Every structure is written in C-alpha cells, then in structure tokens.
Design an enzyme around this catalytic site. Structure first.
Site, PDB file in Angstrom:
ATOM      1  N   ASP A 159      -1.527   2.808   0.605  1.00  0.00           N
ATOM      2  CA  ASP A 159      -3.065   2.475   0.620  1.00  0.00           C
ATOM      3  C   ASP A 159      -4.060   2.909   1.735  1.00  0.00           C
ATOM      4  OD1 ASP A 159      -1.828   1.737  -1.483  1.00  0.00           O
ATOM      5  OD2 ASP A 159      -3.933  -0.103  -1.754  1.00  0.00           O
ATOM      6  N   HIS A 210      -7.813   2.461   2.211  1.00  0.00           N
ATOM      7  CA  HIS A 210      -9.081   1.976   1.762  1.00  0.00           C
ATOM      8  C   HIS A 210     -10.224   2.315   2.303  1.00  0.00           C
ATOM      9  CE1 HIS A 210      -8.183   0.097  -1.898  1.00  0.00           C
ATOM     10  NE2 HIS A 210      -7.005  -0.430  -1.077  1.00  0.00           N
ATOM     11  N   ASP A 234      -5.435   4.820  -3.246  1.00  0.00           N
ATOM     12  CA  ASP A 234      -6.006   4.462  -2.893  1.00  0.00           C
ATOM     13  C   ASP A 234      -6.752   4.546  -2.026  1.00  0.00           C
ATOM     14  OD1 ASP A 234      -5.509   2.427  -5.049  1.00  0.00           O
ATOM     15  OD2 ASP A 234      -6.036   0.594  -4.203  1.00  0.00           O
ATOM     16  N   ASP A 258     -12.555   2.793  -0.928  1.00  0.00           N
ATOM     17  CA  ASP A 258     -13.390   1.273  -1.829  1.00  0.00           C
ATOM     18  C   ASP A 258     -12.712   0.759  -0.387  1.00  0.00           C
ATOM     19  OD1 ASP A 258     -14.404   1.859  -4.099  1.00  0.00           O
ATOM     20  OD2 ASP A 258     -12.708   1.365  -5.197  1.00  0.00           O
ATOM     21  N   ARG A 259     -13.462  -0.472  -0.043  1.00  0.00           N
ATOM     22  CA  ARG A 259     -12.946  -1.794   0.493  1.00  0.00           C
ATOM     23  C   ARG A 259     -13.812  -1.218   2.121  1.00  0.00           C
ATOM     24  NH1 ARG A 259      -8.949  -2.710  -2.345  1.00  0.00           N
ATOM     25  NH2 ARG A 259      -9.984  -4.658  -3.955  1.00  0.00           N
ATOM     26  N   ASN A 274      -5.468   3.310  -8.140  1.00  0.00           N
ATOM     27  CA  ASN A 274      -6.198   2.722  -9.140  1.00  0.00           C
ATOM     28  C   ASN A 274      -7.329   2.839  -9.346  1.00  0.00           C
ATOM     29  OD1 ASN A 274      -4.809   0.352  -7.047  1.00  0.00           O
ATOM     30  ND2 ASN A 274      -5.857  -0.438  -8.767  1.00  0.00           N
ATOM     31  N   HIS A 275      -7.646   2.889  -7.772  1.00  0.00           N
ATOM     32  CA  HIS A 275      -8.786   3.228  -7.158  1.00  0.00           C
ATOM     33  C   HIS A 275      -9.735   4.192  -6.689  1.00  0.00           C
ATOM     34  CE1 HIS A 275     -10.082  -0.911  -5.339  1.00  0.00           C
ATOM     35  NE2 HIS A 275      -8.643  -1.299  -5.591  1.00  0.00           N
ATOM     36  N   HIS A 304       1.751   5.407  -7.303  1.00  0.00           N
ATOM     37  CA  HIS A 304       1.133   3.651  -6.803  1.00  0.00           C
ATOM     38  C   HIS A 304       1.684   2.528  -7.017  1.00  0.00           C
ATOM     39  CE1 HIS A 304      -2.934   1.992  -4.325  1.00  0.00           C
ATOM     40  NE2 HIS A 304      -2.788   1.499  -5.650  1.00  0.00           N
ATOM     41  N   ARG A 309      -3.932  -9.470 -12.517  1.00  0.00           N
ATOM     42  CA  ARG A 309      -4.543  -8.452 -11.686  1.00  0.00           C
ATOM     43  C   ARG A 309      -5.426  -8.515 -13.288  1.00  0.00           C
ATOM     44  NH1 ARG A 309      -3.845  -4.706  -7.115  1.00  0.00           N
ATOM     45  NH2 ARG A 309      -2.105  -5.401  -6.866  1.00  0.00           N
ATOM     46  N   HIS A 317      -0.049  -0.238  -3.256  1.00  0.00           N
ATOM     47  CA  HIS A 317      -1.108  -0.307  -4.505  1.00  0.00           C
ATOM     48  C   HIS A 317      -0.676  -2.854  -3.646  1.00  0.00           C
ATOM     49  CE1 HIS A 317      -3.117  -1.800  -7.720  1.00  0.00           C
ATOM     50  NE2 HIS A 317      -1.824  -2.261  -8.272  1.00  0.00           N
TER      51      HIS A 317
HETATM   52 MN   LIG Z   1      -5.074  -0.929  -3.399  1.00  0.00          MN
HETATM   53 MN   LIG Z   2      -4.248  -0.477  -5.894  1.00  0.00          MN
END
Ligand SMILES: [Mn+2]
Ligand SMILES: [Mn+2]
Length: 294
Positions: A59, A61, A87, A90-91, A119-120, A168, A216, A243
């Site tokens: 990741d 991000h 990923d 995001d964030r 997944n993002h 992922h 989740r 992940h």
């Molecule tokens: Mn992530």
């Molecule tokens: Mn993820």
C-alpha cells in the site's frame, strides 16, 4: 502527443523537498496518462505472469514522498522492475502525484513496471476516503471519473515465476481455478461479494484455520490450513499480499507460506510502522528492504 519524459521529470523534480510540496501537471496531461495507461492495462492479461528479478511493494495511499523514497532504495525505473499491489490513493495527501508517477512509469516501461488493483481503486470507496476530494480540490470531478475508468481496467493478480501468487487482499473460497481470474471481464467495478471482491478485500487470520467472517463487513478471513491447501493445489510456494498495516513493513504467516507487505511508513501519521519492499531474484529467493518512519 503525450510528453512522458517531461511529465516524469516534473514529478521527480521535487525529490529531496520536504513532504507536502505539490506538482502541478496540466489536466490534459493527467487525462492522457489515464487513457494511455488504460490501453496498456487492457492489452495485457488480467492475471499477469511475471518473471524475476522484481521488486514488490504494498500500500502507498498517496504518500508521494514515501513512494519516491521506495524508488531511491529500490532503484528508479528502469533500473529495477516493479510490481505494486494496489491501494495507491486515499488517506494520504498526495494521491494525484502518487498515481500520476505510477501511470507515467507504466506508459514508459510497460513490460517492466506493473500495477495491480487494490480495494481503493474503486470509485465507491475512493469517493469516501479522500481521492474524490483531492481531485475536486485540485482539478475537477471529471478528472476523478477519468481515473475510475482507468482503475476499472487494472489487472487483479500476478503469478511470479509460477511460484509466487500476488494480489491485494488474498484468497477467495470461490477460487477453484486460476482460469476463473483470467475470465474476469474488464472494465468492471468491484462487486460487493464474490471472487473479485475477495481478492481485493480478504485477510489472513491467525486465530482461524479455515474460512471465517471478516470484521471489515465484507469478504472473509482465511487461516493457515486454507493457505497450505491452496499452495499444494496450485503448486505454488508463496502468497504475497498487502492490504493490512504491519509494524515491520512485512510479516510472514503460516510458516512463511504467506507474506503481507506494506510500503507506507508512518501510515496516516498515526501508526509507527516501517515500510517494506520485497526483492525476488532469479533463483526465487526473497529479500526485504526496510524503510523506517522519519
Ligand atoms: Mn490500504
Ligand atoms: Mn486495501
């Protein structure tokens, strides 16, 4: 029309600067990266079959300056070959620069540089966790949609030298055959259940052995017995996934049959974690490079 060299030069010009400094590409240039990368993603298989040697990252991000860090430890392309496990956005505060540099390198070195979907890389998720806001703030909503169209074409998994299965999230109880992954049709959004969902959302769990429910609220957890059977069934040696945040940047599971990689140090500014990057050499020997938080 698209001047990839110039785009790469401007994205790298801020090397060494203190984290936070932005790079301002033109909208048309970013749109060009998305459309051209999307052609490449669709022209390559959805289940990539890659060869060593290779660097593998988890990741990111939108931590752009950590991505630059990775390339200074691993080698800027094309000095090494890369596989990222998703990923990207995001964030973090600099998703645009993160994804732009990744797409630029993908266009420049399409045979030596690879990006999986996380997944993002789904619009229903990156609308909420920051990428939508970053796009709106810096450009506009139409650019966010162009990115979605491109994310929707990312490949889902890779097998490295027929021995390392990479994705992922992890495994799926629906995954009987690798052909099932090769039959997934692109572009597509990520559904709320099923094979594609699970590859991007599932997690290993040390307290279960088989399949369990995932906190989740989506997909499942899998234990060491699932991992052993999967590897025996498909004649593989290792699962490589991302992940989840791991304190040390990487973490083995199930007698080193699975490894979690996470490549964003000091994740969100909240965690004290290191970031790692896995090297696979020609003999299929795995080593790690660690980036401690600054
Ligand atoms: Mn992530
Ligand atoms: Mn993820």
């Amino acid at each position: 029309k698209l001047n990839i060299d110039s785009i790469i030069q401007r994205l790298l010009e801020v090397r060494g600067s203190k984290p936070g400094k932005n790079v301002q590409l033109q909208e048309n240039e970013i749109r060009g990266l998305c459309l051209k990368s999307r052609e490449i993603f669709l022209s390559q298989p959805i289940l990539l079959e890659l060869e060593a040697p290779l660097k593998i990252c988890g990741d990111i991000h939108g931590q752009y300056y950590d991505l630059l860090r990775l390339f200074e430890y691993g080698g800027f392309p094309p000095e090494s070959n890369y596989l990222f496990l998703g990923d990207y956005v995001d964030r973090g505060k600099q998703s645009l620069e993160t994804i732009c540099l990744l797409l630029a390198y993908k266009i420049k070195y399409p045979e030596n540089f690879f990006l999986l979907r996380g997944n993002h890389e789904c619009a229903s998720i990156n609308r909420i966790y920051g990428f939508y806001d970053e796009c709106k703030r810096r450009y506009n909503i139409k650019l966010w949609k162009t990115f979605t169209d491109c994310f929707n074409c990312l490949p889902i998994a890779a097998i490295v030298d027929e021995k390392i299965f990479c994705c992922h999230g992890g495994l799926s109880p629906d995954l009987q055959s690798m052909e099932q992954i090769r039959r997934i049709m692109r572009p597509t959004d990520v559904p709320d259940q099923g094979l594609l969902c699970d590859l991007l959302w599932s997690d290993p769990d040390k307290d279960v052995l088989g399949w369990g429910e995932n906190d989740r609220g989506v997909s499942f957890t899998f234990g060491a017995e699932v991992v052993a059977k999967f590897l025996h069934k498909h004649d593989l040696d290792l699962i490589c996934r991302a992940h989840q945040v791991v304190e040390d940047g990487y973490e083995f599971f199930a007698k080193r049959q699975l490894v979690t990689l996470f490549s964003a140090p000091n994740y969100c500014g909240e965690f004290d974690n290191a970031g790692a990057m896995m090297s696979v050499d020609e003999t299929l020997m795995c080593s790690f490079q660690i980036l401690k938080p600054a």
